[PDB]
């Protein structure tokens, strides 16, 4: 796959904002982009599963798990569901698990780290609310473009050469 953020910054410089988080790459797809859908939750991935069961074509799910890596918010089963529902990728401010299975999956996946522990689903969490991670705002409805070079946010959809 090819790099996409450098071309975006050079062409749409004034309309892009870097989202600066210390994330790692875990999916087979190194680049992914789309409209942002958000989830805010804490040691409970109920809403992560609810959202990923929805149609994700042209969307990127961004999950504010409060930066906690004590438990994983996404495993290989949720990644398989996101794929079946055509999600472009998922960004987890928190931990993921089953990283060897994720490396060969057709989904863009970035996350803060890993944790072999799963969460207890209790229906807690919020969907499509404004997020604040590392003092940076992330708005549902905006657009996000991510690759190994970084992540860029825009208010309107940008043309991606590819």
Swiss-Prot record:
Keywords associated with the record? Lyase, Metal-binding
Q: What class of enzyme is it?
A: lyase
CDD domains, per this entry?
RraA_family (cd16841)
Q: Which cofactor does it need?
A: a divalent metal cation
**Cofactor, free-text remark:** Divalent metal cation.
- For the ligand (substrate), the binding residues are 75-78, 97
Its UniProt entry gives the catalysed reaction(s) as: 4-hydroxy-4-methyl-2-oxoglutarate = 2 pyruvate; oxaloacetate + H(+) = pyruvate + CO2
Any Gene Ontology biological process = regulation of RNA metabolic process
Q: Which InterPro entries match?
A: RraA, RraA/RraA-like, RraA/RraA-like_sf
EC no.?
4.1.3.17, 4.1.1.112
Q: Which residues bind a divalent metal cation?
A: 98
Any one Gene Ontology MF annotation carried by this entry is: ribonuclease inhibitor activity
Q: Which family does it belong to?
A: Belongs to the class II aldolase/RraA-like family.
Purpose of the protein: Catalyzes the aldol cleavage of 4-hydroxy-4-methyl-2-oxoglutarate (HMG) into 2 molecules of pyruvate. Also contains a secondary oxaloacetate (OAA) decarboxylase activity due to the common pyruvate enolate transition state formed following C-C bond cleavage in the retro-aldol and decarboxylation reactions.
* Quaternary context: Homotrimer.
Name of the protein in question: Putative 4-hydroxy-4-methyl-2-oxoglutarate aldolase
Which organism does this sequence originate in? Answer: Vibrio cholerae serotype O1 (strain ATCC 39315 / El Tor Inaba N16961)
């Amino acid at each position: 796959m090819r790099d996409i953020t450098p071309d975006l910054c050079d062409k749409y410089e004034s309309q892009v904002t870097l989202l600066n988080l210390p994330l790692q790459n875990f999916g087979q797809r190194s680049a992914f982009w789309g409209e942002i859908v958000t989830v805010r939750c804490y040691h409970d991935n109920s809403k992560v599963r609810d959202v990923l069961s929805q149609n994700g074509k042209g969307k990127v799910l961004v999950v504010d798990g409060h930066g906690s890596c004590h438990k994983a918010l996404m495993g290989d089963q949720l990644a398989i569901l996101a794929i079946k529902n055509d999600w472009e990728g998922v960004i987890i401010y928190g931990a993921v698990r089953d990283v060897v299975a994720m490396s060969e999956m057709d989904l863009g996946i970035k996350a803060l780290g890993t944790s072999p522990f799963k969460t207890e689903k209790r229906g807690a969490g919020q969907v499509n609310v404004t997020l604040t991670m590392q003092n940076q705002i992330v708005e549902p409805g905006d657009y996000l473009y991510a690759d190994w070079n970084g992540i860029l946010m825009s208010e309107t959809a940008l043309d991606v050469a590819e």
